[PDB]
Design a protein around this ligand. Structure first.
Ligand code: 2EC
Ligand code: 2EC
Lengths: 208, 208
């Protein structure tokens, strides 16, 4: 079945600022989520150094970028450590609150939105370009789940019925109608080469 | 007793470049290590969300900066997750190698040293200002250890005899003789306010 939850009020308010506030360097959402995938991979790798059996769910450590003009979605796939039910419901929220509140301070007090990842809340930069975000995720210790929000204050969590992925995370961006440039091959290569490309696992772009 | 180990050749070569290569924005070492402390704290906090008993070794989550003109040392203390014997010997090394090799690519191919933390190897920026670095560390699952290097290719690891700290990490910088400006109160406040001060735990400076 499906459970509906409210965002914490500060995450709710950050999400409203991102959605509305007119801002035209929206391409940063992609380095932020590639960066989140990098971290996830570092974590399952690190864990696998004292327990090779954590990799039983997959040896491959990579990030895939999969545009789809027909569904109008850009998907970021990584084979990182994934996320548990408590992560999606309570735990990531709690860790996010301070980063959030602080970021909202830096926003109304000078600084620009490109600095979201410096406060550990880059994930929400998805809402620059996406109307709905769907996250399919699987951690060694837990079931596969789907998390979904279109913002406006709430989110859903159901255990995921569909195709098993073994371990990792798949962020599905349902792109706003004026944001389709991010489904184009060379738009994508340009950003990926531009920003993120220090770290550090293979980033493969799937051509349609 | 004391065990002596060789650095991996790429860490050895990064450490030589940092030590020698004349470079005059050396104040970045401090945001890099404050940033490492921030991460450590995020990790023990995150872990404590599904197991409050991880905090049995200390509820306080903070970073202390302790200059000492007499011993000529600047110490960074955090009550983060700390580091185990395998972390100091094998595990952090392994995770560092790619970041390292890549950073050395960016160094001889344009980019400047301020970008060390972007490759997850900021810790080594200590050697801009320190001749010897001593690290006292304690993880819930392991004994207290001391790690020490003056570079030139090797490092030591002994189980730490002295004053128990409960949990966390204490980075002791034995400052080079021309680097004593980093023992001054307002030098320290200036850098700490300048760079790092988005995230996100209390940073307390101890006055002598
Ligand atoms: C910070 C939480 N978080 C955000 N993105 C991810 C991810 N792709 N994999 C695992 N955890 C994540
Ligand atoms: C990346 C490894 N690492 C570097 N610094 C620390 C630290 N203070 N506490 C825990 N781990 C650390």
């Amino acid at each position: 079945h499906v459970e509906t939850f409210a965002f914490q009020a500060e995450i709710a308010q950050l999400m409203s600022l991102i959605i509305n506030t007119f801002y035209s360097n929206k391409e940063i959402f992609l380095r932020e989520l590639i960066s989140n995938s990098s971290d996830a991979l570092d974590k399952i790798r690190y864990e696998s150094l004292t327990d090779p059996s954590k990799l039983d769910s997959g040896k491959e450590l990579h990030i895939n970028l999969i545009p789809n003009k027909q569904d109008r979605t850009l998907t970021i796939v990584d084979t990182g450590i994934g996320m548990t039910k408590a992560d999606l419901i309570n735990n990531l929220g709690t860790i996010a609150k301070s980063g959030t509140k602080a970021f909202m301070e830096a926003l109304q007090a000078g600084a620009d939105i490109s600095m979201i990842g410096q406060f550990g809340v880059g994930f929400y930069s998805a809402y620059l370009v996406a109307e709905k975000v769907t996250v399919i995720t699987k951690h060694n210790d837990d079931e596969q789940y789907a998390w979904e929000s279109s913002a406006g204050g709430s989110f859903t969590v159901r255990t995921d019925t569909g195709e098993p992925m073994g371990r990792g995370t798949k962020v599905i961006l349902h792109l706003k109608e004026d944001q389709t440039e991010y489904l184009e091959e060379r738009r994508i290569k340009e950003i990926v080469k531009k920003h993120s490309q220090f770290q550090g696992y293979p980033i493969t772009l799937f051509v349609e």
